[PDB]
Every structure is written in structure tokens, then in C-alpha cells.
Design a protein around this ligand. Structure first.
Ligand SMILES: [Zn+2]
Length: 335
């Protein structure tokens, strides 16, 4: 593998202001999904890591599906139109399943599923190895859409191969407002106030700390994962961290100042350390990445700064993608 982590560090800037929370009514009618909620502890609005991850996953899986022109029946299976889950999460699974495949599942790349391997999966949620479920009208699609990919008679064999849970390679830290956001942005607007345990709103320009941790598991999929992870963040930028019935809700920017890497080997000799954010990083960033001033420096093996790649304090998700060859070359994986 071997293991260890790559940590994205920066902040989320809102391009638009938002309400805090939702309502019983909107929740009932199936309308406004708003991830920005009140923190019982601090009393300030924040964006839970799980909500960011969920949103990034929901948008990426759709983009992945359409980019490969896959019919939703095939892509979502028994889940119909959302939450794609498959067990093709490691190359072993595909090699092991290849004998029973008439044709490659179209959402696969080099034998594995980017959606599920990155954002996790409960297993064979789409029911790829469960034709009985698929063909049932109430429990499935009323037919088997996977005929061309596998014989329904080989499903029970597949069911011992392709139905394995996978823990997500990415984890999002709860995004709380930065000190700048509390002392300046919130103060300038007179809202929101400290309301521990609407009619207050989160002003446009508000900034929430961004930490995203990616677990390196497969060196061969490292760069590809980073591309898709960044891409999912780009999608969240374009479509919002939340949504109403009609359009996106909560326009955001992911201002990513650095990629911070720690390999398993490095834990044996921590002293070979690059710190982030250091004082220099803080002077270079804020006012552009305000979260850095709230942070004490942490020890990493290698720190890739936006400043190393470009005359910038931060790069946006799509900008990191364009320079990923350059980035991965400097990381302690792939020799
Ligand atoms: Zn999948």
C-alpha cells in the first residue's frame, strides 16, 4: 500500500448566504436540503463532515454515471435513482469475479469503482448479484438489467465475491466557522449570535475550516482518487452544498492551501518533518485562507503548497486536478 494519509487543508467560502437548518414542513414535502445547521455545543452554524461527504458522493456518482453514458437502471440497480453501491472496491474482487462476467460493468475503471472505493459502500446495494430482487416489481426494477454483464445463474457465485462492505477512503472534518468569520464577518452583519443548546442567517463571505483526510490504500489508484475527490468538490461548487426542489442551495468555494502527506514509513522517523501551517503560510494566506491562522502547525512527511505550484495562496479543486501529475510526482508514493 502501504497506508497513511493525504490531508487537504484550507477553508470553505460561501458565495451566497444561507438559512440555518431547515423546517419540518420542507422536510416533509421533500423540498429544501440544507446541510448548514446549528451546533449545540458552540452555538454557531457549521457544516458536518458527513453532510459534505454525502453531498460530494451524491453529485460525483451522478457525474460518473453520465460521463460514461450509463443508464440509471444499470448504475443504481435496485436503488433506482440514487445511492449507487457496489462491491467492486478493490482489484482482487474484480479478478475473482472476472470468470463470471460476460462483459465489464460500465462504471468500472481498471477493475474498481471510483464512487464506492472513495466514498465507501455497504456492499452490493444495487443488487448486481441478486436477480430475484431485481426482477421483483416491488423490491426492484421488475427486470434484470445486468444480463449482458453476468448470467443470473452465476449470481450466487458472484454474491460471495462482490458483496463486501468498504470503508470510505475519504473523511471530512466538521467545518466550523473560522475566527475571522466569527470576529469579522458575523460581527459586521450582527448575525448569527452565540446560540448554544429562523431568523438568523449565515452571511455571504463566511468561511468554514476545511480538513479532508484521504487514506492511501492503493498506490495505483492514488492519483485517480485525488482527481475524482477534487472533481466531486468542483461539483459541489457548481451545484451547491445543498439544494432546493429546483436549483442548488449554498454556493461555495473550496480554497485548498495545501496537500499534506504522511506515509506509514514516516511514522518510524517523524523528525523528517514539514510543518503546516507555519507562520510563513499564515502571512502568505489570510486574508485568502483565514482558517490557517486558527491552526497550530502539524507535522507531515511532505507538504505540497499551492504556493509551490503557483503564485497563489490556495488552489481551487479544478486547479489541483490540472496539476495532479505534478503533485503526485512529489508525494512519497509511486517511487
Ligand atoms: Zn460502486
Amino acid at each position: 500500500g502501504i497506508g497513511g494519509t493525504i490531508t487537504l487543508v484550507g477553508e470553505i467560502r460561501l458565495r451566497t448566504g444561507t438559512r440555518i437548518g431547515t423546517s419540518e414542513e420542507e422536510i416533509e414535502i421533500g423540498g429544501l436540503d440544507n446541510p448548514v445547521i446549528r451546533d449545540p455545543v458552540s452555538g454557531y452554524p457549521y457544516v458536518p463532515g458527513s453532510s459534505l461527504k454525502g453531498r460530494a458522493r451524491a453529485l460525483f456518482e451522478l457525474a460518473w454515471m453520465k460521463s460514461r453514458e450509463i443508464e440509471p437502471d444499470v448504475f443504481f440497480g435496485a436503488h433506482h435513482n440514487e445511492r449507487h453501491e457496489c462491491g467492486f472496491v478493490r482489484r482482487e474482487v474484480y479478478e475473482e469475479a472476472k470468470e463470471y462476467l460476460r462483459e465489464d460493468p460500465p462504471w468500472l475503471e481498471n477493475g474498481t469503482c471510483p464512487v464506492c472505493r472513495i466514498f465507501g459502500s455497504a456492499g452490493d446495494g444495487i443488487g448486481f448479484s441478486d436477480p430475484g430482487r431485481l426482477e421483483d416489481e416491488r423490491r426492484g426494477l421488475g427486470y434484470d438489467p445486468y444480463g449482458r454483464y453476468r448470467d443470473p445463474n452465476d449470481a450466487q457465485e458472484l454474491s460471495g465475491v462482490v458483496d463486501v462492505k468498504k470503508e470510505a477512503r475519504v473523511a471530512f472534518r466538521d467545518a466550523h466557522p473560522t475566527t475571522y468569520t466569527v470576529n469579522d464577518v458575523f460581527e459586521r452583519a450582527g448575525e448569527p449570535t452565540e446560540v448554544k443548546h429562523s431568523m438568523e442567517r449565515v452571511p455571504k463571505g463566511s468561511r468554514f475550516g476545511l480538513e479532508v483526510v484521504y487514506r492511501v490504500e492503493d498506490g495505483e489508484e492514488l492519483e485517480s482518487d485525488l482527481k475524482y475527490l477534487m472533481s466531486s468538490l468542483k461539483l459541489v461548487e457548481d451545484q451547491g452544498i445543498g439544494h432546493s426542489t429546483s436549483r442548488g442551495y449554498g454556493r461555495v468555494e473550496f480554497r485548498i492551501a495545501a496537500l499534506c502527506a504522511r506515509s506509514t514509513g514516516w511514522y518510524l522517523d517523524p523528525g523528517a518533518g514539514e510543518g503546516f501551517p507555519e507562520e510563513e503560510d499564515k502571512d502568505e494566506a489570510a486574508d485568502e485562507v483565514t482558517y490557517l491562522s486558527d491552526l497550530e502547525a502539524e507535522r507531515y512527511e511532505i507538504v505540497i503548497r499551492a504556493r509551490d505550484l503557483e503564485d497563489r495562496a490556495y488552489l481551487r479543486p479544478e486547479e489541483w486536478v490540472e496539476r495532479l501529475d505534478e503533485v503526485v510526482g512529489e508525494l512519497p508514493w509511486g517511487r
